Design a protein around this ligand. Structure first.
Ligand SMILES: O=C([O-])c1ccc[nH]1
Ligand SMILES: O=C([O-])c1ccc[nH]1
Ligand SMILES: O=C([O-])c1ccc[nH]1
Ligand SMILES: O=C([O-])c1ccc[nH]1
Lengths: 335, 335, 335, 335
């Protein structure tokens, strides 16, 4: 034994998409807002991330958070998302996990009906509710950033074989790129992964050329890191089924929070029975996220809605990672 | 299984007298100063202390702490000390403890010659210097709050046995009654411990709520709470031994950093010790702290001295405490 | 960090009197019978016991065990009990402990009404029946080794105080001196504990190496080692209280299953108790075992009775003990 | 918190290829030989495996062992390999890990020079040596089963584009299938994974048709589950570099023990400077295994050698997996 470093994480799976919630092993991180500490992390500790998110600890499609000091009064605690490619500003399937764990472990004093909790992200402070059955969490609704559509139609170019064919782009907290099942020839199922993943990243990269758009408000993030594919379900109590590509080439095991929070737009201004209507969006693996909306905030330059998404996270063990200082791969290695 | 609350501690021992350093299972406490953090703990989440310090988890003696976010400028993380009986404003084995582990587990980036780490009691911030021999920590050298003689001798009381007479009172993080082993007829040895305990608290009671206890600054304290007895040593190296009684009726196995730092800060104001002059305080259990007297500096009332005490802590396992909600002792029990 | 040895235990408490159940950090001991396994432990890897039972890790009292591979036919896993002073051939709170956890953590496939688990002391195999209320364990009901009156009263000795006279001796997993609280002038209360301890061991010494200690079968034992004192209860429910002294000078906080199982196995051979007849033994700490007297069966010398004692254990956290090789107390210390 | 199950694992990475060494959470497994317990595991517990080896805990290319009771005298302990597709009979990169951990953690009492250790696999008992530098493991040589070649030339069929082209087949403890870099057009590097993996499994499956051979001795295992591709290094202190496909479609991050133990055959009967000659075989990721041989056992029907392979394993944290009984994915899910 040597190790030199020792980080305590808690694993969750949020409808299939894993989350490593680091709890103990780094007590304070300087910055004022989560962005300030984020910058500090990305600049000073940075690639603790690599170690936990890459092999031989994690894998390509691994994802996780860091619980921290609030700094902002209000109450609760601070979170910082992360993945094989760096850090997410929001992850939704992270906000659920993080919340579900916190309460289940303690950290947040739990109620009998439903325990509200506000967590500090680098992006906006996030409102998770978590309904509990006397003792334990049943599922979390996380209220999402106002989401909208950037353009109607799209089409550009696809390497093989059709060449052309219409698509669609929107927001969701981060932008997105959505298409249909009928053009390439895919049936979103576990078996065919490679064509989707391999078609996904080239579509991501080649719409970073000049179509690339910045939304009104917040000028820093630009163009696409999230490619999306609908089809509609193979499971009865559902209505759509969809996969999402991102993160140095990784994929989401859940229907995609930020993704779904964006999709359930469109059908607000496209005539599909509007507010407080039931919608259950399911993943490629085949697991459910409930979506529904409330406020519908137009405001000039766009038309937008403030979407409420729900899901379930479960605890899949407790970790105490350590870093043999001779281990030459002690940090990450990418593949 | 079912638990509801699950807290991640790190067992250390510091010349005996172990410390359970809490690391994980609570992420936040807005506080401001580490006393306004301590206050919050005692008036809210005290039910932790009862759990870990008392049986079945802890025992009569048994000491620990909590790592925090600092708020305080620079301050590398900030700490709170706790025992079966309540919370110590400061603790020299508790500090020495926290320091070692923090560096050992990589919570602190470890410097190669000596690692300077600042922690927040908030009995001032404290500057621990952690010596590391290429690979490993050699020893800690914690520089403490200014220490002084408070009132001088005063008169003793009876219940048992005989009204008796002389002793002394002095501060060094908390307030101490420093009396000779002869003055009441004790020999610092395991055979008598029971007596020293039963004696100390009965004293610690009846020299409170009869007298004037106060600190030139920080207000609040107005409580000794710490009874220190002293005789010569059965070790050539050591200069003096001592036991310390506090918290419900619990004893230190280390010479008591705060206790020693207070004693030698009565000397010099006596002339038996001058600046540096190697000092080595011993406990009951053949375990020693290598004191010295660096710099004077009065305290806005009467003259004083900042002392640096030195010692060694060792990591004695990693704990994930959990509390079965049916378990009636869930929050420990007294005896 | 650097440790070299890292052992994985599971803290439980069984009506107080905690048990550290070792689970992980050693995988094998060829032994044959669980005594030939115990032998090996004590003549080799005893340095574990000193570590976990003594300070800094454990304390004066503090009890634990080890889960093993059985070898023995059927036997679901097999156990070894241990304390600060050495190893108990059998223990009713140590058994009740092991049972609960084993089922609780899923080591045993948990049956819904009642879960029958066989463990190997090897003070015989023992049949614990673990009641589970749909989700959770309600209580354990361990059926023990045949118990009996051994020699009857005999005469007491002095050192302190007064030579005195009557008492009794009886077996129930180990050998007990069962004497009244009146017989030496004690009241079973925390205030006196110190006396009961100091008394018990001085007795436990001087009623050994002066007398005839022996078991009709299994040979070897030829040692009491367990002093049991008894008075009436300050509880309506409870029928009798008791304390038990053993191992270097340590006390039980449970009524002492093995201790109680031995006491009521002197009654009936007396006529104050017959088959079933609800019995409830209490400790010093307001904690009770619900005894009964099921079936006779002599012991190849003199008549005897197999008693079933019942109680409750709770999981009080999970430990990964580690031993810094520089740490001079690495293997604990005495006081 | 609920979980119902709680398995303690220790993670390693053996030159990139991960290993989850389960230690605590299942104390005894019935069977006599490791095959008997294996059969028992595969039949009764089975898909604890799925949970730990599949997502959301593990991933497709995850691999691990189970430490157990020896049963066989000799000494030490029992191991059982496992992966997403079931169980391996040998894994070499498992035998190293397992050994490296055991000693590093304790479990096996360690020496000053080199600590021999014999572990019970379902296949033959395995001899790992582990050289240690006063305190810590430097690297393990594991002595491998007698390995040989089944046929010289091969060629069969490849879907695109050449159609034909020569290859080669051998043993290694398990069979294998080896080819060159020059025929399809691949440069074994992280970037191009998919073509190799996708070309690998179809080559695996379509040489399970009737070419399928059983080696002399042990009639149970048949044909191929291991496809292999040499090229030779991009790293100076090496001589070959090679990737290996298997396990429901997974891949090896290390040069492949059983694989390499087979390859370093051929060059014993093909004139390449024979016994006790240095050979370092490196992986697709680019990390070294040392191979060299000793005995060369011809025996009629084949010509064979008993190969000695070396490597390094490092500890990448300690796990305490748990299985929320409501979590619908609580066990595995494949992709
Ligand atoms: O669900 C989300 O919010 C998300 C972010 C990145 C991938 N999914
Ligand atoms: O080491 C000390 O200073 C201390 C505080 C309480 C007991 N010992
Ligand atoms: O509960 C018991 O039987 C026991 C054994 C040792 C102390 N208590
Ligand atoms: O290295 C080995 O022995 C092995 C077995 C399966 C894959 N690699």
């Amino acid at each position: 034994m040597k190790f030199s470093k020792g980080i305590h994480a808690i694993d969750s799976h949020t409808m299939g998409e894993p989350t490593r919630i680091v709890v103990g092993g780094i007590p304070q991180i300087n910055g004022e807002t989560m962005a300030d500490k984020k910058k500090y992390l990305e600049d000073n500790l940075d690639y603790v991330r690599t170690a936990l998110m890459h092999e031989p600890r994690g894998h390509n499609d691994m994802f996780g958070s860091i619980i921290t000091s609030s700094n902002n009064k209000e109450a609760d605690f601070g979170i910082i998302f992360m993945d094989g490619g760096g850090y997410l500003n929001m992850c939704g399937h992270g906000s659920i996990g993080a919340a579900t764990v916190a309460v289940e472990t303690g950290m947040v004093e739990m109620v009998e009906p439903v325990t509200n909790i506000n967590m500090e992200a680098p992006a906006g402070l996030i409102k998770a509710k978590v309904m509990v059955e006397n003792e334990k969490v049943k599922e979390v609704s996380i209220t999402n950033v106002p989401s909208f559509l950037y353009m109607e139609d799209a089409k550009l170019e696809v390497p093989s074989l059709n060449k052309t064919i219409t698509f669609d782009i929107s927001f969701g907290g981060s932008f997105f790129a959505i298409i249909h099942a009928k053009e390439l020839g895919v049936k979103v199922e576990t078996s065919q992964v490679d064509v989707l993943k391999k078609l996904g990243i080239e579509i991501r990269d080649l719409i970073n050329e000049k179509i690339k758009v910045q939304h009104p408000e917040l000028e820093h993030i630009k163009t696409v890191d999230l490619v999306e594919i609908y089809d509609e379900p193979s499971n009865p109590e559902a209505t759509y089924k969809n996969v999402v590509i991102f993160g140095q080439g990784q994929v989401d095991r859940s229907p995609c929070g930020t993704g779904t929070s964006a999709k359930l737009a469109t059908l607000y201004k496209k005539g599909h029975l509007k507010i407080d209507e039931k919608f259950v969006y399911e993943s490629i693996t085949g697991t459910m996220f409930k979506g529904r909306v409330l406020e519908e905030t137009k405001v000039g330059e766009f038309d937008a809605i403030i979407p409420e998404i729900t899901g379930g996270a479960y605890i899949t063990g407790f970790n105490h990672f350590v870093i043999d200082p001779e281990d030459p791969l002690k940090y990450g290695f990418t593949v």
